[PDB]
Coordinates of C-alpha atoms and ligand atoms in Angstrom, one line a residue:
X48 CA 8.9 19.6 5.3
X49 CA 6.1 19.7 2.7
X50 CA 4.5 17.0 1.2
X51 CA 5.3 15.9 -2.3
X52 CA 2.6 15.5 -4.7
X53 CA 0.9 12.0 -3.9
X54 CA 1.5 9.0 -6.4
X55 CA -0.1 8.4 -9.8
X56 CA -3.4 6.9 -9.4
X57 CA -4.4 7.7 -13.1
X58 CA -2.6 7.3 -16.2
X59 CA -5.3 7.0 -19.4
X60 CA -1.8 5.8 -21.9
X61 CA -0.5 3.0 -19.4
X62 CA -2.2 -0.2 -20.8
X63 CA -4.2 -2.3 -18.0
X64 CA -5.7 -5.0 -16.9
X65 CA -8.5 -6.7 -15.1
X66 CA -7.4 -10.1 -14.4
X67 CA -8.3 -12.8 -11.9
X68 CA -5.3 -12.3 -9.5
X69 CA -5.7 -8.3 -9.4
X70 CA -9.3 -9.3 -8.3
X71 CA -8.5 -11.2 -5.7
X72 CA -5.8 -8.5 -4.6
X73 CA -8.7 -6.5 -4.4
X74 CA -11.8 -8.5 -2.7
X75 CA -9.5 -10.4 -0.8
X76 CA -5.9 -8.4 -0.1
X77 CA -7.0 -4.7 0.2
X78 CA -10.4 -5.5 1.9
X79 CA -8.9 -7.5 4.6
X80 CA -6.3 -5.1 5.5
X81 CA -8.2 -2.0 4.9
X82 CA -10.4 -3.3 7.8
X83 CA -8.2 -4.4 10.0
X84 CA -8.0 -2.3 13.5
X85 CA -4.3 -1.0 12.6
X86 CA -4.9 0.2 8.8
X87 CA -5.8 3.7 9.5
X88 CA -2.4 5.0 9.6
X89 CA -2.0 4.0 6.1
X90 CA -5.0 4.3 4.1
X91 CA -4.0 8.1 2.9
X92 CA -0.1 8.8 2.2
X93 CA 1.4 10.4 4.5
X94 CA 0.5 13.7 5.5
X95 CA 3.9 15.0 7.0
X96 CA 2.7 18.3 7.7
X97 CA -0.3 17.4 9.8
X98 CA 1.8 14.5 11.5
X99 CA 5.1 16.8 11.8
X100 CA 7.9 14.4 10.2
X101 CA 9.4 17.0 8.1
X102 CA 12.3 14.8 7.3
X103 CA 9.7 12.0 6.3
X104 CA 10.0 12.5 2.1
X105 CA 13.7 13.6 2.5
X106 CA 13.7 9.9 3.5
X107 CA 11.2 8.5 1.9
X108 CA 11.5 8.8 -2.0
X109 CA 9.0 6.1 -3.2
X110 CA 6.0 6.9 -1.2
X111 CA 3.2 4.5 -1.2
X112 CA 0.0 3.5 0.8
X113 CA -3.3 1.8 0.8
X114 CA -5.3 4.6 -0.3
X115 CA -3.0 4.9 -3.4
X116 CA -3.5 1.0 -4.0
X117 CA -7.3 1.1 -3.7
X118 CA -7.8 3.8 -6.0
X119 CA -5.4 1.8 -8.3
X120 CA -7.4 -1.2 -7.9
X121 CA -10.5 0.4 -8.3
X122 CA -9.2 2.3 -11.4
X123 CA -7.7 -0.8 -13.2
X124 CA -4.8 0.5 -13.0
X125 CA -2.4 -2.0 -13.4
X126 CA -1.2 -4.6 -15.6
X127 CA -0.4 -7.4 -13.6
X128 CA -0.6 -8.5 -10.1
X129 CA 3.5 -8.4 -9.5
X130 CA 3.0 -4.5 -9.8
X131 CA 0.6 -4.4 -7.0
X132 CA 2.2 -6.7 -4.7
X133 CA 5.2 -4.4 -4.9
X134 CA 3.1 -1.5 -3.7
X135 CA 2.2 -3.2 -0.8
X136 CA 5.6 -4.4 -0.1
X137 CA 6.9 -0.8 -0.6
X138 CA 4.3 0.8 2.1
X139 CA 5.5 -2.2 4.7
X140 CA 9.1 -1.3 4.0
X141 CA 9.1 2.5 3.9
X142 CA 7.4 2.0 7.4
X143 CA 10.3 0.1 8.4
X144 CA 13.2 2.2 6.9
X145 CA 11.6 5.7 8.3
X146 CA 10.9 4.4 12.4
X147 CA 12.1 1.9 14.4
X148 CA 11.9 -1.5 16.1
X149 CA 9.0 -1.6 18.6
X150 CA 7.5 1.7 17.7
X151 CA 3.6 1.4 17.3
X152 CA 3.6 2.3 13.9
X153 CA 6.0 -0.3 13.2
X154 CA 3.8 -2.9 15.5
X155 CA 0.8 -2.4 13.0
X156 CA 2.9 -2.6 9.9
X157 CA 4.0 -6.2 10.9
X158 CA 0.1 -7.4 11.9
X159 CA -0.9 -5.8 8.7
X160 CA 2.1 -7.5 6.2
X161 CA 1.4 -11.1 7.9
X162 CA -1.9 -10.9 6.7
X163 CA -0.8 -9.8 3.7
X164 CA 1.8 -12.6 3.4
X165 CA -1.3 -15.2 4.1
X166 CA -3.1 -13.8 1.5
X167 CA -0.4 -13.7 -1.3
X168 CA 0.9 -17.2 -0.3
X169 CA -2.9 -17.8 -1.8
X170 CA -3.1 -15.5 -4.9
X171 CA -5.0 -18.0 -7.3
X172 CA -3.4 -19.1 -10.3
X173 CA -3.6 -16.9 -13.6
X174 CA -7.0 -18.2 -15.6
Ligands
25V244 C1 -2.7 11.7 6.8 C2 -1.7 11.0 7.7 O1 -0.5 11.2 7.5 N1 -2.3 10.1 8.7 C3 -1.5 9.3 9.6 C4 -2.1 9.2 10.9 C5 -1.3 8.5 11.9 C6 -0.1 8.0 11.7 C7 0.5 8.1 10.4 C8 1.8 7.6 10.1 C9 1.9 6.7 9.0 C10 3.1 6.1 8.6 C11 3.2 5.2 7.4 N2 4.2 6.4 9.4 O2 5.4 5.7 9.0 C12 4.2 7.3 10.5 C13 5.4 7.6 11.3 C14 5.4 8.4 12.4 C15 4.2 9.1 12.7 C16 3.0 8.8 12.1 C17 3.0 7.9 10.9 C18 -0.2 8.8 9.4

């Protein structure tokens, strides 16, 4: 029933990387979504204390959300743009694997990952 420490945002001995296609997954990916009318439930981890899911972490073992992915993104973070793509695709499908069809949450998980898809099916090539 408590939350877990949230994910690494900082890690000064992973090497990193700014390249073109992290950019983009920044000025493009993350700013789209981050606007979007349905991202607030997902730019913070979840707080299942506040929200009372205290079975949320019990079922949710790789946590992961958009305020994790900006702060990576902002932090250079990452080495390549595979690894941030599959934080994204983790958030959509924890979403999916802790509620279920039709609820709301669920609703603006889907409007959020089609953008995302639309987006990715664009990532520019490596320069
Ligand atoms: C800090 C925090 O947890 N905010 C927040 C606000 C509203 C909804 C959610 C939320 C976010 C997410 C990812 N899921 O799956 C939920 C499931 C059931 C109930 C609420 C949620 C999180």
């Amino acid at each position: 029933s408590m939350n877990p420490p949230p994910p690494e945002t900082s890690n000064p001995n992973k090497p990193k990387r700014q390249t073109n296609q992290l950019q983009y997954l920044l000025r493009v990916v993350l700013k789209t979504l981050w606007k979007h009318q349905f991202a607030w439930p997902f730019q913070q981890p979840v707080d299942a204390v506040k929200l009372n899911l205290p079975d949320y972490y019990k079922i949710i073992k790789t946590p992961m959300d958009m305020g994790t992915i900006k702060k990576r993104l902002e932090n250079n973070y990452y080495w390549n743009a595979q690894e941030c793509i599959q934080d994204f695709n983790t958030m959509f499908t924890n979403c999916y694997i802790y509620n279920k069809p039709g609820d709301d949450i669920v609703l603006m998980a889907e409007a959020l990952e089609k953008l995302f898809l639309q987006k990715i099916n664009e990532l520019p090539t490596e320069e």
